[model samples]
Target: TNPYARGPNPTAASLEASAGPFTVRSFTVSRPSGYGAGTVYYPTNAGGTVGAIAIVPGYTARQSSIKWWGPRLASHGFVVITIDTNSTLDQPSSRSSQQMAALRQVASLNGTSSSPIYGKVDTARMGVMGWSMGGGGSLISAANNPSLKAAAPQAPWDSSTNFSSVTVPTLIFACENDSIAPVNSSALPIYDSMSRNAKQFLEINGGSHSCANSGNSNQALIGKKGVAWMKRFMDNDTRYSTFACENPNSTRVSDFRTANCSLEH
Candidate 1:
């Protein structure tokens, strides 16, 4: 029943990347809060300067889904942390009725403050990555984290009233063929409605919503492109000027040949 316990699936093994190109080490940070733990991946050192992130997945999901990107991003010189949200569990101590609570816990998460990887994290540049219901939750959580610089939501359910409060640098990823969260759905409209911050929309034109997150070829592409976008946002990679190849009108969302789309930070 644990979604993240599966480690990086073999099909996505090639995704394994350098653990640290910027003085970083990948590790997990567990909390004593009980019930659900914060599953993470990051570098050994924050380089005294790092952009730490707190990634949240969909309901009933764990942190493992985003594990494949840890080493790669860490090696690129970032302290990354992906959580298996208490957002879903029934444990009273682990309740995540609001995104703010889940995010507060994630931003402050550290097993022992004395540990090298504990409080050393730079919370200012901390980012949030969430999917489906978790996407709206991440947005709601932004209120508590003024330091939350960015957000990435995949196939985010538009019908949910939870996202109207979001006002951060948001990147909403949707699929063109996705009936669940169609292009005209709230994801695209919400993306365009953001106040004054930078916003980008990635719509994989010919794929279904669930298929992109599935562990098949579709998931693989989604994972790859998502990681790239995260890398550009969570870390300082000026070299990625081409990062948002598909901004106002990316050609990516126009065909079946392309199954991925991303907005540059």
Candidate 2:
């Protein structure tokens, strides 16, 4: 069987099947020379007619493992694209910019295709998601991305470095017991620095980095929460207006010592 095939979840192989019918395409990009990435499509697609989201996978995570996220997002009326950045290596990959750029290219090609379903995507509604090293990569794009409307960073490394530069509406989820980025201590500095108009920080009631991935913990309810955030920014759901200043859903915290916007929504 082809390693790139989107197949059913195999109990023996630990592979999921419902990633739906997603085409695996690779573009030969020369600008960000010597970089390779994979994009996975998932179900939940209203075809190519809905919102487009560019998702970046976690550190050392293969493209297949990341497909779990794509199909889930697709199920929610989103065109989810997960690019394998681990192939590039290190704390941050060299093709971070190229990965974001490639998504833009895909949107461009899709819009003008012989049979166009959606002529254009709402860039202001576009989002970027990443975990661990990929999480930081998303932040890099989010910081300077004027076209990006939303962002979600999970278990990132060194977000403080570019925290102040990230201007996009961001949903930062951290685990209570996260060692790499403790919600109350290390991670707060970056979370606290976000602009009031565009940020929400959620500490999973009882969460940690690794535990969230495989079973129940930081990763268990992430899909639900992530879909909520994507719906707000990508689909522009007004009900998610918990970000409106002084909304009841938001609660101010004194521990981090940073002014925050309304994210409870």
Candidate 3:
């Protein structure tokens, strides 16, 4: 048993509680290379360096839209970075570049003497996630970079959803009632196209494109599922396999699909 293993807590996958014994902290990465301003959240007093993750916001959105993931994931034993793009209107490709740059910045900070995160990050076990167009960019980043351990994209949208080349494990949160980036044309197509990746598509029943955003009521459900996915894939911990593979039974879910859900790479 190693540190940062997933839990089979009595509460199951609930966001209302902290899964680990860490206090979270936040700071700003003013001008990370190849990216815009970034807000980074990390765990303190966790007793060991843990995995890291990067998040991006959708078109016309700022860090506020996706910042919730920062504290949420960090409290669960990850170094999470949520960023604002160079331009609020940056498309998926540009967002992808910024998202990756943010990850690199976090990894770089792990070695900087004067930084708060020095020697506190496990750069090798990294993940990516985001909202809407940012979600699409996450997929794009995973597609272009095979080194990423995991990705969870919420209501993803892109110019093209054909990311068949992606090999990283991914979890796509699809909003059922989304009018902006409909599931059929975006999330579904993208999920379907990734025939070679370990992926999961969770369709939130009657959800809007912003269903998984900050302050969502379904955080109890979506948050838990997301954390489980990252824990299983990014950390490559078997403790999360049951939580990810056998947990979602389509009770309130509009649809549930998976491939190699626990066939770890």
* Top-scoring candidate (TM-score): 3
Candidate 2, residues 1-265: lDDT per residue as tens digits? 3221122322211212332234432333223222355453533224334556776656667455445566566655555666655364645544357457656754664565541223434333577776666667777777767567677776665535447767677776566678766665545666766664366666554456643343443232456556556655665554434322222232222121213444454
Q: What lDDT tens digits, residue by residue, belong to model 3 across residues 178-223?
A: 9999998889999999988788899989999899999787776787
lDDT of 2: 0.53
Error of 1 at 60 (Å): 2.9
What residue pairs clash in candidate 1, if any at all? 20-75, 21-75, 24-43, 24-44, 25-42, 25-43, 25-44, 26-42, 99-141, 100-141
RMSD of each: 8.3, 9.1, 2.2
Model 1 lDDT per residue over 1-265, tens place = 3211112222223433323244445545545233255644555543444565555566666665555545555554455555665446432112223334434554555435655556655555666665665565555555345456666666665344334455555666776777655666656665655555445666676757654453524543455445545544554342332443234343445532111233436
Winner on lDDT between 1 and 3 is 3
Candidate number of the best lDDT? 3
**Model 3 weakest lDDT span, ten residues long:** 6-15
Candidate ranking under TM-score, highest first, comes to 3, 2, 1
> What TM-score would candidate 3 get against the native?
0.93
Candidate 1: C-alpha lDDT: 0.51
What value does the lDDT take at residue 88 in candidate 3?
91
TM-score against native, each model: 0.67, 0.68, 0.93
